[PDB]
Amino acid sequence: TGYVGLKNQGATCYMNSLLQTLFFTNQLRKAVYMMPTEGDDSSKSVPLALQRVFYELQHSDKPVGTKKLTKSFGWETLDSFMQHDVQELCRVLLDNVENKMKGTCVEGTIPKLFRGKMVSYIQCKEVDYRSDRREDYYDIQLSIKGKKNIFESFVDYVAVEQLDGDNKYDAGEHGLQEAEKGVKFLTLPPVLHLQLMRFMYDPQTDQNIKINDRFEFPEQLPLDEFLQKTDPKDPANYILHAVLVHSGDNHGGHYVVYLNPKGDGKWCKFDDDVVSRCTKEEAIEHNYGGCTNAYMLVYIRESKLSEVLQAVTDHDIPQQLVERLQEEKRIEAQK
Ligand SMILES: O=C([C@@H]1CCN(CCc2ccccc2)C[C@H]1c1ccccc1)N1CCC(O)(Cn2cnc3ccccc3c2=O)CC1
């Protein structure tokens, strides 16, 4: 393959799976290396630690380690990774890096890549009163129960809820009323983070548990029909890039990720230290379920494919950074 793996070294769960995903968002990687971490303290800077990981993924022949990363954002209780979502890990990592980038030439890279926008409304039937709230989003949480596929999940997301007797809306001055409540998308970002909601509250044991039901997702995903307005020059057509996968339960469980890093439909399986070529069927259909299946999808917008996935060379890494890491790697010859 010529791609390199991440070491296990503990109970970091989905951590390795996320990290490869971000690394092969090439546009992000380049802007990460541009951060001015020249002054930052080795041990406690998250920005520096991410730089180090990306460097090693890019240069090393040998499986790559992450203790200094884990240490830097400080998840070291017995239940740290067990009690958190993937998207919480994502938000910790990308929010540290966004802040470090302000006042530089690469400020605003994170929002450019990940942030879209959305409108939640309540509208009264008989009386003139409406409430619109506008929100930004970096990811989307999709419902899987009772749903054949991504199209069904989207239809459900933009569904008009109905407010009737006993469930009427309190419209303030106007008192209780009958209303429609809904959600629309105004924009979908270049890189689309979708979590499938597979960890759900069990009323029978007062806990949350994993649904292994069937759920289909396509290689190519048109979403124009879920937009309030379309643009014929940039249709919302997306390409699949990453499939984050899990098998088992709390007794025994394993995290892996499938990528086609160049966007060309040539897939590889990343399993900690071992990376290997695989088929398209192994990345996509063998992860539908219906036990090894998908909990997170990454899609990239067709018109943005080449920019997001632009090539990287060793010249894209500044000298000052390289020299700092050559120093650490010299001290790391203690056998
Ligand atoms: O790794 C995990 C879970 C950690 C905990 N694990 C079992 C440990 C346990 C111990 C003692 C009692 C019980 C359980 C379940 C693991 C899981 C794997 C596969 C599927 C769902 C869960 N992850 C990452 C992916 C995850 O973030 C996706 N996601 C994201 N957003 C949502 C939003 C709304 C509803 C569900 C989800 C959701 O599942 C879940 C947490």
Curated annotation (Swiss-Prot):
**Per the record, what is the consequence of mutating C13S?**
Catalytically inactive mutant. No effect on p53/TP53 and PTEN binding but is defective in deubiquitinating p53/TP53 and PTEN. Partial loss of KMT2E/mml5 deubiquitination
Give the active-site positions. C13 (nucleophile), H254 (proton acceptor)
Tell me the superkingdom of the source. Answer: Eukaryota
Q: Which residues form the USP domain?
A: 4-302
Conditions for induction: Up-regulated in regulatory T-cells (Treg). Down-regulated during neural progenitor cell differentiation.
Tissue specificity note: Expressed in neural progenitor cells (at protein level). Widely expressed. Overexpressed in prostate cancer.
Localization in the cell: Nucleus; Cytoplasm; Nucleus, PML body; Chromosome
Task: Give a short account of its post-translational modification.
Answer: Isoform 1: Phosphorylated. Isoform 2: Not phosphorylated.
State how changing H246A affects the protein, per the record: Complete loss of activity
**What family, per the record?**
Belongs to the peptidase C19 family.
Domain annotation text?
The C-terminus plays a role in its oligomerization.
**What disease is mentioned for this protein?**
Hao-Fountain syndrome: An autosomal dominant neurodevelopmental disorder characterized by global developmental delay, varying degrees of intellectual disability, autism spectrum disorder, poor or absent speech, and mild facial dysmorphism. Most patients develop seizures. Additional variable features include hypotonia, hypogonadism in males, and ocular anomalies.
How the protein assembles, per its UniProt entry? Monomer. Homodimer. Part of a complex with DAXX, MDM2, RASSF1 and USP7. Part of a complex with DAXX, MDM2 and USP7. Interacts with MDM2; the interaction is independent of p53/TP53. Interacts with DAXX; the interaction is direct and independent of MDM2 and p53/TP53. Component of a complex composed of KMT2E/MLL5 (isoform 3), OGT (isoform 1) and USP7; the complex stabilizes KMT2E/MLL5, preventing KMT2E/MLL5 ubiquitination and proteasomal-mediated degradation. Interacts (via MATH domain) with KMT2E/MLL5 isoform 3. Interacts with OGT isoform 1.
Entry function: Hydrolase that deubiquitinates target proteins such as ARMC5, FOXO4, DEPTOR, KAT5, p53/TP53, MDM2, ERCC6, DNMT1, UHRF1, PTEN, KMT2E/MLL5 and DAXX. Together with DAXX, prevents MDM2 self-ubiquitination and enhances the E3 ligase activity of MDM2 towards p53/TP53, thereby promoting p53/TP53 ubiquitination and proteasomal degradation. Deubiquitinates p53/TP53, preventing degradation of p53/TP53, and enhances p53/TP53-dependent transcription regulation, cell growth repression and apoptosis. (Microbial infection) Contributes to the overall stabilization and trans-activation capability of the herpesvirus 1 trans-acting transcriptional protein ICP0/VMW110 during HSV-1 infection.
State what protein this is by name: Ubiquitin carboxyl-terminal hydrolase 7
This protein's species is Homo sapiens
Quote the gene name from the UniProt entry: USP7
**Full-sequence range covered:** 211 to 554 of 1102
